[PDB]
Structure formats: C-alpha cells, structure tokens
C-alpha cells in the first residue's frame, strides 16, 4: 500500500508543508485567508489565492490498474458583508496535475481557464460556489462536483449561514467510483449532501497535487471572505 496523509488542526505561518499562491496568507491566529482581507476587515474584490500540499499524491498506477481511495476534510467560513452588489465567487477543493500554478479567477475559482469541457485539465474539484455564472445552476450558494470543467457534473444548493464555520467531508471510493461531499453547519445543524460517479483513472494523472482555492469577484465589492481553519487529507493506493 502507498499511503499518504496530513492534518492541520490550525495553520501556522512559514511551515513549508504548504505552498501558498496568489493572495493566500496565514494569519498569526492560525487562519488561512484564501482571498485578500483589507485592513478594515472587509474582503477585497478582484482577489485570487490558493494553497497546495507540497507533496505529490499517487492516485493511480498505469502498470497495475489499481486506483487510490482518498478523503479530505476542512472547515471554512464565508462571510458576505456587502449589501450590494451580489457576492462572488466561492472556494474549492481541487486535485490536479503537479506543479500547477493559479489559473483564471472570478467564476473559474483559480482552477480553470474557461467554461470549456476539456480532458486536458486533468482536474477533479468540489466547489462551494457563491455566484451564479452563465454555466451555473440558478441557485447559490451550491456545492458542485467539477470533472475537467467549471460546468459541474452535479450540483446541490445550500443556504449560507453568513460568517459561520462549515465542516466539509469529501470522500472517494475507488471500487464504486463514488465521489461524495457533505457540508455541515454546527451553528444551525444543517446538513447537505452530494454524490456522483467519477472514474479518476480517466480524469487524473497518476500523481496529483491537492489544494484549496478561493476567488472574489470581477467588480467592486462583489466579494466575500474565504477563510479556512483546518484541513486533513488521506490517500491510500492498494497494490
């Protein structure tokens, strides 16, 4: 078995287990701010930021045909403090090719380049999308499962609990090809679920980077916080 795992119950500035990209900072109090917070505490528009675990992850091996099962968990808050215009754009857990740099922002969430469906992306993602783009369902926020496209293969509306912490569980079972995600708000007790078939052998490269990305919007004050308080991950590739 090729097993890999990590776990941050909080973040600490400077620990090179994490590559920070774009606007992402780790505060002194241990919070990963994916998108820029101005000095008055308000979230800035036109901001993109990501973080990746600095170690590659073996997900499948094109010599044995085995596929790795895996699971990630994290806690985040999105606060939408502006009365106008509508908030944007969201945050996302993603798995893609290694050594990746941030892509386009706004509705592509720092992960995609366009609204194309394109096997060249080689990227799996679970999004928490706060702005309804032309390729989106009308309901926001929504969870979505993104396979080689910002146009999710499956979505699920959820109600924001503005500024509260949400717990996320994301799990892939290789044998059934099921990818599931759950969002829980302790503040309210609300529980949301989503699941779809995903053949990661046909999507992901053998090795992948895993990461979190956030983005705010393309006009002034179309913005929200994308703060992350903890992040764990476990992958296990059978022989």
Ligand X SMILES: CC(=O)N[C@@H]1[C@@H](O)[C@H](O[C@@H]2O[C@H](CO)[C@H](O)[C@H](O)[C@H]2O)[C@@H](CO)O[C@H]1O
Ligand Y SMILES: *[C@@H]1O[C@H](CO)[C@@H](O[C@@H]2O[C@H](CO)[C@@H](O)[C@H](O)[C@H]2NC(C)=O)[C@H](O)[C@H]1NC(C)=O
Ligand Z SMILES: *[C@@H]1O[C@H](CO)[C@@H](O[C@@H]2O[C@H](CO)[C@@H](O[C@@H]3O[C@H](CO)[C@@H](O)[C@H](O[C@H]4O[C@H](CO)[C@@H](O)[C@H](O)[C@@H]4O)[C@@H]3O[C@@H]3OC[C@@H](O)[C@H](O)[C@H]3O)[C@H](O)[C@H]2NC(C)=O)[C@H](O[C@@H]2O[C@@H](C)[C@@H](O)[C@@H](O)[C@@H]2O)[C@H]1NC(C)=O
Q: Is 99 in the site for ligand Z (CB under 6 A)?
A: yes
Q: Is 163 in the site for Na ion (CB under 5 A)?
A: yes
Distance, in Å, from the CA atom of 150 to the CA atom of 199, rounded to the nearest integer, reads: 17
Q: Is 184 in the site for its own copies (CB under 8 A)?
A: yes
First-to-last alpha carbon distance for the chain, in angstroms, is 6
DSSP conformational letter for 49: E
The 3-state DSSP class for residue 1 equals coil
Min CB(78)–its own copies separation in Å: 19
Binding test (CB under 6 A) with ligand Y, winner from 55, 118, 186, 191 = 118
Binding test (CB under 6 A) with ligand Z, winner from 23, 59, 103, 168 = 103
Binding test (CB under 6 A) with ligand Y, winner from 31, 78, 103, 203 = 103
Q: CB within 8 A of 132, min separation 6: which ones?
A: 138, 139, 140
Q: Is 89 in the site for ligand X (CB under 6 A)?
A: yes
Binding test (CB under 8 A) with its own copies, winner from 13, 157, 186, 238 = 186
Distance, in Å, from the CA atom of 213 to the CA atom of 69, rounded to the nearest integer, reads: 22
Pattern 138-167, binding to ligand Z, x per CB under 6 A?
Answer: ------------------------------
What is the CB neighbour count within 10 angstroms for residue 66?
17
The 3-state DSSP class for residue 118 equals coil
Feature table: binding site for Mn(2+): 127, 129, 136, 142
Annotated binding site: 127, 129, 131, 133, 136, 142
């Amino acid at each position: 078995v090729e097993t890999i795992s990590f776990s941050f119950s909080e973040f600490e500035p400077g620990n090179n287990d994490l590559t920070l990209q774009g606007a992402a900072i780790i505060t002194q109090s241990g919070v990963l701010q994916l998108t820029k917070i101005n000095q008055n505490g308000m979230p800035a528009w036109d901001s993109t930021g990501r973080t990746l675990y600095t170690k590659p992850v073996h997900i499948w091996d094109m010599t044995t045909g085995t596929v790795a099962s895996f699971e990630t968990r994290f806690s985040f808050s999105i606060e939408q403090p502006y009365t106008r215009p509508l908030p944007a754009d969201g945050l996302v857990f993603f798995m893609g090719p290694t050594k990746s740099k941030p892509a386009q922002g706004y509705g592509y969430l720092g992960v995609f380049n366009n609204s194309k469906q394109d096997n060249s992306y080689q990227t799996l993602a679970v999004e928490f999308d706060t702005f309804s783009n032309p390729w989106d369902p009308p309901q926001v926020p929504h969870i979505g499962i993104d396979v080689n496209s910002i146009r999710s293969i499956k979505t699920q509306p959820f109600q924001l609990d503005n500024g509260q912490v949400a717990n996320v569980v994301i799990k892939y079972d290789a044998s059934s090809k099921i990818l599931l995600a759950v969002l829980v708000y302790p503040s309210s007790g609300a529980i949301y679920t989503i699941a779809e078939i995903v053949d990661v052998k046909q999507v992901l490269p053998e090795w992948v980077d895993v990461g979190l990305s956030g983005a705010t919007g393309a006009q002034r004050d179309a913005a929200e916080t994308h703060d992350v308080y903890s992040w764990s991950f476990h992958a296990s590739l059978p022989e």
